[PDB]
Design a protein around this nucleic acid. Structure first.
Ligand SMILES: [Mg+2]
Ligand SMILES: [Mg+2]
Ligand SMILES: [Mg+2]
Ligand SMILES: [Mg+2]
Ligand SMILES: [Mg+2]
Ligand SMILES: [Mg+2]
Ligand SMILES: [Mg+2]
Ligand SMILES: [Mg+2]
Ligand SMILES: [Mg+2]
Lengths: 108, 138, 199, 176, 109
RNA sequence: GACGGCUGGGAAGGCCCCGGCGGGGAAGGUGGCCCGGGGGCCCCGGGUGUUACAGCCCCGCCCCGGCAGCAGCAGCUCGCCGAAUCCCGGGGCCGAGGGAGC
RNA sequence: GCCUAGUGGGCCACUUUUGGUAAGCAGAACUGGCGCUGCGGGAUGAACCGAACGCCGGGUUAAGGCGCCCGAUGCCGACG
RNA sequence: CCUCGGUUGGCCUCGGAUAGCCGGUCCCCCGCCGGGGUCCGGUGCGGAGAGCCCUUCGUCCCGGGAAACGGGGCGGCCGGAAAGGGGGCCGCCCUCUCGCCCGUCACGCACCGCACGUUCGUGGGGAACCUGGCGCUAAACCAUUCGUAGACGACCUGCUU
């Protein structure tokens, strides 16, 4: 997670070099917030990455601007991910429920 | 053969109730199923506590059967039960249960990968010892 | 997916209540070793209870009357059926989810059996109260396969001891293997010790 | 009275209404063991109406207060003199208890009478409760705890939390 | 890649003894055996997934045989972790004892 | 999560014999001493007795002794409360009405 | 104030009460019920307990309950 | 292609005692490695079901760790009847140094916030067409007969060495 947008949607990227999740909106009632964190105080989010930017338009292709914005945020947030050990693999993994593992008991 | 006896000065571990997870000293017995206890170093006020919620430990203080809280604390901090209780395997397998309770998702991922390795490194040498038994049994 | 319960040391109605609730909540249950179920009260009292059960029959046609099954498996089955709403389709499906056995048959002897502490004799009865054995009650009321079940049970137990001795040899080999490789697993043992999975 | 929960002891002081005959009536103090002060004042009017010729209409209550135990950390022996109605006859008793509070002692007496004698709280009258020293006790179930170096184990520890897994593999340990 | 829903059982309708209220369902969630544990699941969405004979359209997909009665958790039911849930259509009584997926995403944490 | 009132202007309890200086007392009798036996000086028995090599109970103020604190930071030793009471958060159900004007 | 239908076989219960050995018997008083009335509870049930009813959603209760049938203690419930 | 649907990682196992258990151990004493006395640990069971195993986004470069005795796969031996073992093991003429962990390096429909997703699943059942090999060419009933049988059915019998 990076920044809350002006419509309340959560601007997010778990980086495309790890997740195949781009710069994208999500919704806070539909995401689980784990208590593992990266300091992104020095991260310049571009000012134009807004809800008007992320709104669906109308056969879908990534524009060159959307290609270069994902790089411009990944080249900054990725050295912060790789400076804490095993978090890149942690983000590469997906979350799944298995036997005996109950969500009211697991603390995230 | 019983080893743990309810007596004046036995440290008991409180299993449930409002003072669970704590250590008390049995100061006196009232009747069949209730004892005046007192934890002056584990923050438990002197009170009647039933026997079914305390679990007896292998620690016996020496104080009289009507001596007050400060003599109980004198015996407790002279015997150093706050460190001798922690040195036992009982408190270590309590705090291991606490740590597995406090595991976060990143913690569970790192545990999964480290255990994924440790089991395979042991598992190869287990079979290595097995065929080192069959090749040396003949 | 199957709940396999060792019937030894359990009380009949307590186990049958818990099994009836599980097969209503939709879990296939296999209760093995039903001759090891205990019944509270003295044996003469329990024997005359089942003798009063036997005295009941349809006076005009006992072949239509109440079927007094003699095997401990079928007696336990009848208690669960009396605890189930067996005259509806949900009740019949609940009963059909439940299997009962005498001894521990070959599907379930190479399987771990569960125990219910809320139905156990040692938990649920005072130690001075006299109990009875379902196998002995069953045999003395007309079950014929008590001795052969006992012979097959000692035949199963003597192989279970073989499996147990091999399991112990494997686990001591596991312990020698840990003390062998405690140089190259020491950087991975500390993770499991800091997160409380080992000590 | 329905002896609900832990009883509380109340000092209830009452008197008659001052008539032109009796310009200031004498004041009567009673210790009532009751669930709350409303029940305490009602039992006070019961007992005072039984002892004197004084009613709630002709009388008043000038004080009703819970009397706290002066030593609720000290184990004491309690002697309770009792009057109760059985199914046939009325009996005087004396019973002995062990507790930290005299209100806990009286409610222990009420549940004990309900257990041993099938007697409900409406048929039981406390007459006197006194903290008795250990030498002057007459009941061996109280007197057996009068030992300085007392020592007993907990022999057959039954498994409580019978439904924590409800389906475990390992049969329980009851020795500890 | 893996399971994302909790397992629950359609234990029955909200009922007394002789009056069952079909509009409210009683769920038994696996792992919840106390009323204190129910506080996570209150408000969560629950799905009765079932297959039928004719195909129906799948959102974000091609038509197949799976069909869903959607619902959500409203309140706990009793001390032992059973839960009351309300669905869009009242659940069929053929589903009693069968599985209801309890989704994770009316997230509160 | 935070505040306050009342009570026996809470009761007990905590710290400074570890409250000071005195006076006693007895036991569910601590040291000692005596008896008895069980071990390798120690423990458990039985007796005696008043502090000693534990404790308990009854100028107690030597300004209610002096301090904390106070119906007590667990998220429990025992209450009744709130003009002496407020803040914050979560779950569920529902959106009737349709020209209010300025 | 007028017109007026139906009714003019009753039965049950706390308390009082007469005859009778007694009766799910016969006869009165007071009040409440049933008849005329479903509903929750007493397994079942004219009368008992709770409560009286338009068609529904949420909440909460009464009397009853909470091993399983069967909703609810699967409380590490208290003392016997 | 229909249709029936449920399901959404497995646990491959001492006997049991509960005023007692569990695991190692020889200097022992008995038996065909099994049992007991001795000793050592453990016991609110951590040789723990408050558990264990597996754990999956995928691919590309190069490095370290672990592995090398390994990973994948054709010919033999053991293992099972209460409702029978799909396992362990012997070699093979093959192939790789990958799999697992910590890193370097980028990539992929990034489908633009959204739901039945993700398995067990070459699931069971049903018909049908392909498409190659090994094969195998039957009874039941009626009818007739019998009378050890019989109301009728049924039953018992015979019908080319
Ligand atoms: Mg009459
Ligand atoms: Mg009549
Ligand atoms: Mg009529
Ligand atoms: Mg009327
Ligand atoms: Mg009515
Ligand atoms: Mg009845
Ligand atoms: Mg009434
Ligand atoms: Mg309603
Ligand atoms: Mg009932």
């Amino acid at each position: 997670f990076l920044k809350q947008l002006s419509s309340g949607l959560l601007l997010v990227t778990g980086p495309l070099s790890l997740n195949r999740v781009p710069l994208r909106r999500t919704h806070q009632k539909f995401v689980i917030a784990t208590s593992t964190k990266i300091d992104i105080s020095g991260v310049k989010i571009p000012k134009h990455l807004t809800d008007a930017y992320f709104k669906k338009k109308k056969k879908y292709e990534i524009t060159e601007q959307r290609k270069v914005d994902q790089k411009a945020v990944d080249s900054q947030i990725l050295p912060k991910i790789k400076a804490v050990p095993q978090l890149q693999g942690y983000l590469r993994s997906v979350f799944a429920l298995t036997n005996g593992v109950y969500p009211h008991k697991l603390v995230f | 053969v019983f080893r743990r006896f309810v007596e004046v000065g036995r440290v008991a571990y409180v299993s449930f109730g409002p003072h669970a997870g704590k250590l008390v000293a049995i100061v006196d017995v009232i009747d069949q199923n209730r004892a005046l206890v007192d934890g002056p170093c584990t923050r438990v006020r002197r009170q009647a506590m039933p026997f079914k919620c305390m679990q007896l430990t292998d620690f016996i203080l020496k104080f009289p059967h009507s001596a007050r809280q400060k003599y109980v604390r004198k015996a407790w901090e002279k015997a150093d039960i706050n460190t001798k209780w922690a040195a036992t395997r009982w408190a270590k397998k309590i705090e291991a249960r606490e740590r597995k309770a406090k595991m976060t998702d990143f913690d569970r991922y790192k545990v999964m990968k480290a255990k994924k390795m440790r089991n395979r490194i042991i598992k190869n040498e287990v079979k290595k010892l097995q065929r080192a038994a069959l090749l040396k049994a003949s | 997916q199957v709940l396999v319960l060792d019937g030894r040391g359990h009380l009949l109605g307590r186990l049958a209540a818990i099994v009836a609730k599980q097969v209503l909540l939709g879990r296939k249950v296999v209760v093995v070793r039903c001759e090891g179920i205990n019944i509270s009260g003295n044996f003469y009292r329990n024997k005359l209870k089942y003798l009063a059960f036997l005295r009941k029959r349809m006076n005009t046609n006992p072949s239509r009357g109440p079927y007094h099954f003699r095997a401990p498996s079928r007696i336990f089955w009848r208690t669960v059926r009396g605890m189930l709403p067996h005259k509806t389709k949900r009740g019949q499906a609940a009963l059909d989810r439940l299997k009962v056995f005498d001894g521990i048959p070959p599907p379930y002897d190479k399987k771990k059996r569960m125990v219910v502490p809320a139905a156990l004799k040692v938990v649920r009865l005072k130690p001075t109260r006299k109990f009875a054995y379902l196998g002995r009650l069953a045999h003395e009321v007309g079950w014929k396969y008590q001795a052969v079940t006992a012979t097959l049970e000692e035949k199963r137990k003597e192989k279970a001891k073989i499996h147990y001795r091999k399991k112990k040899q494997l686990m001591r080999l596991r312990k020698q293997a840990e003390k062998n490789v405690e140089k190259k697993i020491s950087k991975f043992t500390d993770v499991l010790k800091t997160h409380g999975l080992l000590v | 009275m329905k002896a609900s929960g832990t009883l509380r002891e109340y000092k209830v002081v009452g008197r008659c209404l001052p008539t032109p005959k009796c310009r200031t009536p004498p004041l009567y103090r009673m210790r009532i063991f009751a669930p709350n002060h409303v029940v305490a004042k009602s039992r006070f009017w019961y007992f005072v109406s039984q002892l004197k010729k004084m009613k709630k209409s002709s009388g008043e209550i000038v004080y009703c207060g819970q009397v706290f135990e002066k030593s609720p950390l000290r184990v004491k022996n309690f002697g309770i003199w009792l009057r109760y109605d059985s199914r046939s006859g009325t009996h005087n008793m004396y019973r002995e208890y062990r507790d930290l509070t005299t209100a806990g002692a009286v409610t222990q007496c009420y549940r004990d009478m309900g257990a041993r004698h099938r007697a409900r709280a409406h048929s039981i009258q406390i007459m006197k409760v006194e903290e008795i020293a250990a030498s002057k006790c007459r009941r061996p179930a109280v007197k057996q705890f009068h030992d300085s170096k007392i020592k007993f184990p907990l022999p057959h520890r039954v498994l409580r939390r019978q439904h924590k897994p409800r389906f475990t593999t390992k049969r329980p340990n009851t020795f500890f | 890649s893996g399971r994302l829903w909790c397992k629950a059982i359609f234990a029955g309708y909200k009922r007394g003894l002789r009056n069952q209220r079909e509009h409210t369902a009683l769920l038994k969630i696996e792992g919840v055996y106390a009323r204190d544990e129910t506080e996570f699941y209150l408000g969560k969405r629950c799905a009765y997934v079932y297959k039928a004979k004719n195909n129906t359209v799948t959102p974000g997909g091609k038509p197949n045989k799976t069909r869903v009665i959607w619902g959500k958790v409203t309140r706990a039911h009793g001390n032992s972790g059973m839960v009351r849930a309300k669905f869009r259509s009242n659940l069929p009584a053929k589903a009693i004892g069968h599985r209801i997926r309890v989704m994770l995403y009316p997230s509160r944490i």
